[PDB]
Ligand code: HEM
């Protein structure tokens with residue numbers, strides 16, 4: 001049931017008049033239409049203004065300027081003195097009731113951002129990730145083995161059985177979340193980054209119920225670790241002193257929520273889109289499987305470029321900015337479309353070819369660099385690598401058998417369900 005594709009094919013041309021970045025219906029279209037829309041913007045309207053989507057649109061606040069060029073997204077990322085992460089990194093205004101749960105370091109500027117990031121950043125270094133490499137592989141090995149055992153007919157949903165669980169288990173392990181609570185945590189983060197998709201929720205009170213629930217989970221776990229320290233990130237949070245003063249319970253909960261949402265709702269889509277690409281372009285599977293360790297570094301970078309799991313991130317101007325002939329005003333919202341930068345014809349020879357040997361590969365799936373560069377980048381790369389190594393070893397012919405069920409989202413390039421089959 002997988003539709004045939006030809007590597008290197010550009011999307012059909014999308015007329016400039018047909019693009020509505022502010023409509024839910026646009027984000028419901030398939031990737032060819034979306035990719036073609038962003039190609040048209042790069043060529044004919046590389047900076048342009050759009051209204052918020054209608055999803056909770058009455059409280060969204062103002063519209064935004066869309067940056068579609070790799071170099072413009074780079075400039076914005078590298079100059080937070082102009083393009084601020086405060087007050088929010090999605091288009092929607094962060095209302096007071098949302099700020100209760102989501103006013104974390106990701107919506108702060110330096111120096112407070114850096115002081116918060118430094119509490120945990122040593123647990124995400126390459127050498128620390130190398131320590132828990134063996135744990136990461138054991139968890140991936142066991143999940144892939146369970147897929148074979150749980151599905152003797154050789155068919156299953158890659159997302160529920162592997163792509164979701166592996167990153168979930170790792171970040172829960174690093175936070176010190178008990179094994180019995182994994183499913184509950186994943187349900188909550190699925191809803192928090194699925195608002196607007198009816199398979200997740202379209203009811204904002206249910207969203208607020210979930211946010212309440214994970215916030216209360218976080219504070220209860222932090223309260224236990226304050227009494228009895230463990231060697232986990234939650235204990236690092238309760239123990240930290242920023243200029244002699246400890247974090248508030250509110251600050252601890254927001255930080256906890258940031259880490260588990262980010263760890264649960266990103267890598268899984270790199271894996272699902274990676275499987276889809278290897279299914280559509282079998283020469284690339286054949287190349288990688290023939291020399292997994294020789295090709296893994298370039299293959300992992302190309303999977304992130306192809307998937308762009310985070311579609312965009314917002315910034316806010318503190319001064320007037322005249323960029324590429326477009327005059328934007330102090331206080332305007334500006335959006336950084338990584339999904340577009342990662343197809344930029346000025347930065348990639350042959351952007352429409354999925355090439356697991358690609359080098360160089362200046363992909364900005366982890367953002368354009370700078371102060372908020374993805375804290376989990378090293379971890380995510382290892383998570384992707386070990387999952388595909390275990391699929392290669394245990395079920396080398398695993399392939400998608402249907403087009404995926406796509407998450408309805410402007411922010412997250414989500415695959416909800418991906419049927420696969422193996423011999
Ligand atoms: C392939 C997987 C992932 C992708 C594509 C991705 C993408 C991103 C992007 C685009 C940003 C914003 C960068 C910027 O503003 O310049 C970000 C920030 C962040 N990510 Fe990742 N992410 C991934 C996996 C993870 C994982 C597994 C974690 C584990 C906890 C994580 C934790 C974070 C955190 C904490 C931040 C905020 C950093 C800060 O504000 O200083 N991410 N991520």
Ligand SMILES: CC(C)CCC[C@@H](C)[C@H]1CC[C@H]2[C@@H]3C(=O)C=C4C[C@@H](O)CC[C@]4(C)[C@H]3CC[C@]12C
Pocket residue numbers: 055056088089090092093094098102106192193195257258261262265266310
């Ligand atoms: C992908 C990761 C790297 C980052 C995750 C960030 C998470 C923890 C946080 C940071 C800011 C939060 C959003 C917000 O402030 C406003 C709204 C509007 C509301 O109508 C629906 C929910 C939404 C999109 C929030 C969803 C959760 C977000 C993205």
